[PDB]
Amino acid sequence: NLPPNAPACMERQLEAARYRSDGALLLGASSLSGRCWAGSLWLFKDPCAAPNEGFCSAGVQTEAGVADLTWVGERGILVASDSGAVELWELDENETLIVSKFCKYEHDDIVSTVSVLSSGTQAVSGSKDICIKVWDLAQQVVLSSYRAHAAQVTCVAASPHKDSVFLSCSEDNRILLWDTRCPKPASQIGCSAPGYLPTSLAWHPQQSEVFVFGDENGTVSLVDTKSTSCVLSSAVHSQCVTGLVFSPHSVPFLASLSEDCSLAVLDSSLSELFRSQAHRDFVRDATWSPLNHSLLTTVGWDHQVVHHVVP
Amino acid sequence: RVSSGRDLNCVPEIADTLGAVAKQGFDFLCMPVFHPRFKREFIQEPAKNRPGPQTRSDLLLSGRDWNTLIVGKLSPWIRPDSKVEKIRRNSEAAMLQELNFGAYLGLPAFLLPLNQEDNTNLARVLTNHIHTGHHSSMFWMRVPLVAPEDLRDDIIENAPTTHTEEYSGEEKTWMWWHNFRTLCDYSKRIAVALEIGADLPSNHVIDRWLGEPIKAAILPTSIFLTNKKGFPVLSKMHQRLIFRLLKLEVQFIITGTNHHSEKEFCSYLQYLEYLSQNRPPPNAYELFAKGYEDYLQSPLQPLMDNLESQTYEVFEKDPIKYSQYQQAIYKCLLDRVPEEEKDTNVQVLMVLGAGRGPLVNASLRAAKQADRRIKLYAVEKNPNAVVTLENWQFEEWGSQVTVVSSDMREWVAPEKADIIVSELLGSFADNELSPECLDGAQHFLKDDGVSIPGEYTSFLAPISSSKLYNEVRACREKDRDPEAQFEMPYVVRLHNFHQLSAPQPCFTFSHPNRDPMIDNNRYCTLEFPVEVNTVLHGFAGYFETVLYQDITLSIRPETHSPGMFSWFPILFPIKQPITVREGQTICVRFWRCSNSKKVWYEWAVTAPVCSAIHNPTGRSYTIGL
Numbered sequence: 001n002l003p004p005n006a007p008a009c010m011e012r013q014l015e016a017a018r019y020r021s022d023g024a025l026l027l028g029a030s031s032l033s034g035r036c037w038a039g040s041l042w043l044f045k046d047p048c049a050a051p052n053e054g055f056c057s058a059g060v061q062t063e064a065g066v067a068d069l070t071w072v073g074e075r076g077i078l079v080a081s082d083s084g085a086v087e088l089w090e091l092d093e094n095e096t097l098i099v100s101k102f103c104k105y106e107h108d109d110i111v112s113t114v115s116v117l118s119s120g121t122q123a124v125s126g127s128k129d130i131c132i133k134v135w136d137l138a139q140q141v142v143l144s145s146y147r148a149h150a151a152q153v154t155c156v157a158a159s160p161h162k163d164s165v166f167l168s169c170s171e172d173n174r175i176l177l178w179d180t181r182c183p184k185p186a187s188q189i190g191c192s193a194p195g196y197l198p199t200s201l202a203w204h205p206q207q208s209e210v211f212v213f214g215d216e217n218g219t220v221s222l223v224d225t226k227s228t229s230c231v232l233s234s235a236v237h238s239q240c241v242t243g244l245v246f247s248p249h250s251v252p253f254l255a256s257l258s259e260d261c262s263l264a265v266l267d268s269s270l271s272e273l274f275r276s277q278a279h280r281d282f283v284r285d286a287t288w289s290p291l292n293h294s295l296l297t298t299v300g301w302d303h304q305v306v307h308h309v310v311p
Numbered sequence: 312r313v314s315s316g317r318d319l320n321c322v323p324e325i326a327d328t329l330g331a332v333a334k335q336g337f338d339f340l341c342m343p344v345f346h347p348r349f350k351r352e353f354i355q356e357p358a359k360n361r362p363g364p365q366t367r368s369d370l371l372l373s374g375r376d377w378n379t380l381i382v383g384k385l386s387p388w389i390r391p392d393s394k395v396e397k398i399r400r401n402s403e404a405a406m407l408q409e410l411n412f413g414a415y416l417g418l419p420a421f422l423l424p425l426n427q428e429d430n431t432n433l434a435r436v437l438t439n440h441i442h443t444g445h446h447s448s449m450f451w452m453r454v455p456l457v458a459p460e461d462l463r464d465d466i467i468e469n470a471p472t473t474h475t476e477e478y479s480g481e482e483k484t485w486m487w488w489h490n491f492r493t494l495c496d497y498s499k500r501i502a503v504a505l506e507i508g509a510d511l512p513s514n515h516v517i518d519r520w521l522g523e524p525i526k527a528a529i530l531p532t533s534i535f536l537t538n539k540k541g542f543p544v545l546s547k548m549h550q551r552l553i554f555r556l557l558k559l560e561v562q563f564i565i566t567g568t569n570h571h572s573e574k575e576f577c578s579y580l581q582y583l584e585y586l587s588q589n590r591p592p593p594n595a596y597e598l599f600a601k602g603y604e605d606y607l608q609s610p611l612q613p614l615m616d617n618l619e620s621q622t623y624e625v626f627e628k629d630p631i632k633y634s635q636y637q638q639a640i641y642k643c644l645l646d647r648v649p650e651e652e653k654d655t656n657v658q659v660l661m662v663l664g665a666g667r668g669p670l671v672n673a674s675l676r677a678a679k680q681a682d683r684r685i686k687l688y689a690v691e692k693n694p695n696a697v698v699t700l701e702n703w704q705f706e707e708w709g710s711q712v713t714v715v716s717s718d719m720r721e722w723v724a725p726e727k728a729d730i731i732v733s734e735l736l737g738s739f740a741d742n743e744l745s746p747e748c749l750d751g752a753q754h755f756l757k758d759d760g761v762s763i764p765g766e767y768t769s770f771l772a773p774i775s776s777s778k779l780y781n782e783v784r785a786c787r788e789k790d791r792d793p794e795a796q797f798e799m800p801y802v803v804r805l806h807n808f809h810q811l812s813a814p815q816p817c818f819t820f821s822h823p824n825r826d827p828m829i830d831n832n833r834y835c836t837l838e839f840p841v842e843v844n845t846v847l848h849g850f851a852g853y854f855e856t857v858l859y860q861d862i863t864l865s866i867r868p869e870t871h872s873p874g875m876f877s878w879f880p881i882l883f884p885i886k887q888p889i890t891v892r893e894g895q896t897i898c899v900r901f902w903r904c905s906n907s908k909k910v911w912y913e914w915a916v917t918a919p920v921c922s923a924i925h926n927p928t929g930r931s932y933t934i935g936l
């Protein structure tokens with residue numbers, strides 16, 4: 001059976017996979033080819049059932065594609081749309097419907113990245129229009145609009161526990177550390193040479209002044225914001241690092257997405273522990289199960305919702 | 312009115328989207344031909360063998376719609392000049408794939424960005440696609456007036472914006488375009504899509520785009536100010552630019568989402584239409600010049616050739632020219648014969664090169680106005696024009712006018728003349744060979760006789776026009792020098808161009824010529840102070856003439872006779888464009904040469920760099936004697 005609103009089919013290009021604290025699975029998908037170029041939002045109470053449409057808890061269709069996604073608490077879904085809109089979708093009282101809370105067209109091009117800030121009341125979006133916008137999820141408005149970069153914004157990442165702090169990176173080769181408290185909020189951090197363009201950012205879940213960043217040449221780098229000169233790095237992928245996600249573990253494992261169609265799991269020294277060639281297309285997202293911390297899920301463009309067992 | 316287009320980087324349903332933009336008032340749509348986020352792999356497996364379809368079907372629109380309403384957009388991930396080899400190769404294959412899909416669709420134009428300094432591989436791939444077939448498709452290079460790096464918010468504590476003046480650095484996006492189009496060998500298929508930002512740069516940066524092939528202007532919604540009624544409007548400085556662009560007849564493009572939520576997407580276009588309608592109207596000259604703008608024409612040779620009938624007709628419909636000739640004769644008649652002699656003294660008036668008879672009639676209107684007696688002779692070499700003259704003299708003029716079907720240089724006059732009146736002048740004054748014509752005729756002018764016109768002077772000004780340079784470039788013909796087109800003058804309504812320095816006199820001729828050794832050959836050196844960074848493509852020529860005393864004619868823009876459309880500027884091109892830096896002097900050399908058979912010009916640029924001497928020995932161009 002398909003929920004009362006859910007479409008008969010889910011678009012081939014799976015962009016996002018987000019495990020809720022209870023264990024439910026959030027799916028973002030787009031139609032990146034064919035007659036219609038739209039998107040859809042899916043909820044799977046059984047993660048082993050995905051990507052099967054007729055076996056989901058809830059489902060809805062957005063007007064355009066889903067470039068990025070994030071959980072906004074337990075019933076909130078924040079969407080980075082191709083329309084240039086940032087969308088907030090509220091999950092039903094029964095959690096059987098996904099209803100549009102707000103659709104605001106503030107960006108002048110595709111919104112490619114979204115990150116919810118520590119409070120869960122504010123969020124930051126990064127667009128192709130080169131701007132970065134700070135949002136009020138309750139008031140449905142943009143508090144601040146920042147044009148700090150020179151090229152498109154690839155990734156925006158809120159700090160785990162600070163509402164004022166967030167990371168951003170762009171095709172202008174800049175990794176910006178933000179702090180809404182300073183009059184000049186951004187600070188251009190980065191190592192000696194410019195090198196290859198930054199593509200992905202992952203804040204450390206325990207060390208609040210540490211983060212990792214993946215480039216366009218498949219390199220993964222470990223960075224201490226204080227020492228401000230990239231000490232540790234490894235050539236993990238043969239193509240652009242699409243995403244970086246840390247495990248919920250006390251000493252977290254680092255999962256690494258790529259366009260080389262592979263997944264990799266790394267330790268503190270960025271050494272390879274696991275590798276999966278499960279995907280036949282681009283690896284788009286990764287979520288560790290809040291229920292089983294050794295379980296890691298992945299979504300790709302090959303419409304595969306793979307489940308991995310991490311040693 | 313305005314030809315407008317909507318720019319979108321998101322099209323979920325092509326049929327719906329097009330209908331909405333058409334309902335909004337847009338004449339065309341700029342949209343992706345593949346999905347913007349759909350990165351493709353062409354080398355590495357498994358991503359290489361990705362199942363199709365690679366994009367939406369051509370069946371979704373009619374051929375007519377594809378040909379006239381859709382402007383394709385290159386995918387933003389396609390980066391042919393990336394520092395990463397794999398990305399360079401994938402972006403190459405993807406660029407070829409995308410451009411070929413647009414040609415397969417018969418798209419009227421396709422958009423490609425110039426958003427960084429190095430676009431060498433982007434250019435190579437486009438140039439290679441241009442030479443793969445023979446199509447009429449246009450490539451619009453999306454360039455901003457101001458690079459995004461140079462307009463970024465000053466919010467990076469440890470990387471502040473440079474608050475100092477950087478003249479050449481502020482012009483950087485022009486250099487991006489210049490390099491890209493030089494690499495692509497000035498393809499007529501490569502044009503500019505100029506992206507206008509919220510804050511306009513210094514005028515020199517804007518003026519840097521004068522003479523460039525701007526086919527489209529991109530106006531983001533962000534740049535629109537909001538009026539007291541809540542409607543989107545523009546700053547007076549932005550309005551200034553729009554008005555400059557409307558004369559270039561560019562296609563306006565609206566990009567970005569609607570920030571004026573209370574109103575619809577038709578309001579942005581409504582303001583452009585409002586500005587378009589309110590601009591000053593086209594004057595007598597501007598209305599005539601319409602259609603002749605940057606159209607290269609051959610200069611007329613009324614001496615060597617016999618002008619067509621509809622050609623004299625065109626010349627005759629210039630009112631200011633003949634009003635001025637009338638006045639100059641009127642003034643001469645009173646100065647030559649006093650009121651006490653107004654019935655005993657009859658003036659021998661000779662129209663040398665009478666055409667169909669406008670100067671003959673003007674001479675008559677002038678002798679009636681001055682209340683003096685005149686004896687007219689109408690000398691004309693064109694026998695076809697002489698048919699009109701003889702039918703006029705029999706039907707109207709009478710015995711008063713003696714039509715002479717001859718060349719003034721050969722005609723043996725029965726008596727000398729008091730006044731010789733002629734209109735043997737071209738856009739460069741002496742380019743129709745008036746010095747030689749009147750030199751062989753002045754023997755039958757009284758020792759104290761007046762020549763109307765008494766004097767004429769040619770002027771030159773250095774110009775920049777990559778548009779007109781490419782136009783001259785396209786004038787290659789078979790069975791001649793492959794570069795002969797650059798060694799000849801053109802008559803043209805110079806429109807999309809930049810005058811780099813104030814006109815300066817070149818050649819002057821006075822009639823009658825008192826010199827015992829009459830030499831119409833010349834050599835002139837001019838030094839033109841240039842205060843902009845630019846590229847020289849040639850020299851505009853104009854002229855000034857003294858008919859009699861204060862009665863004059865001019866095509867020099869400074870002193871242009873109001874409403875006179877008989878002459879358009881001449882253009883002397885140069886084979887290779889020359890880079891001129893701000894503060895440099897352009898030194899040009901001009902010669903007027905001749906033998907017994909023909910007259911021609913030769914020219915060379917000697918500063919800031921040398922050119923070859925153009926038209927040596929009149930090998931590419933001569934004016935027949």
Ligand SMILES: C[S@@+](CC[C@H](N)C(=O)[O-])C[C@H]1O[C@@H](n2cnc3c(N)ncnc32)[C@H](O)[C@@H]1O
Nearest residue numbers: 613614626664666691692693718719734736748
């Ligand atoms: C009609 S005016 C041309 C003025 C015109 N508006 C222009 O743009 O130059 C030139 C006339 O003088 C005549 N003409 C030129 N050379 C001549 C010559 N040597 N003897 C007699 N008539 C001559 C031509 O045949 C022509 O009719």
Ligand SMILES: [Cl-]
Nearest residue numbers: 424425426453
């Ligand atoms: Cl651009």
Ligand SMILES: [Cl-]
Nearest residue numbers: 517518520521
């Ligand atoms: Cl301009």
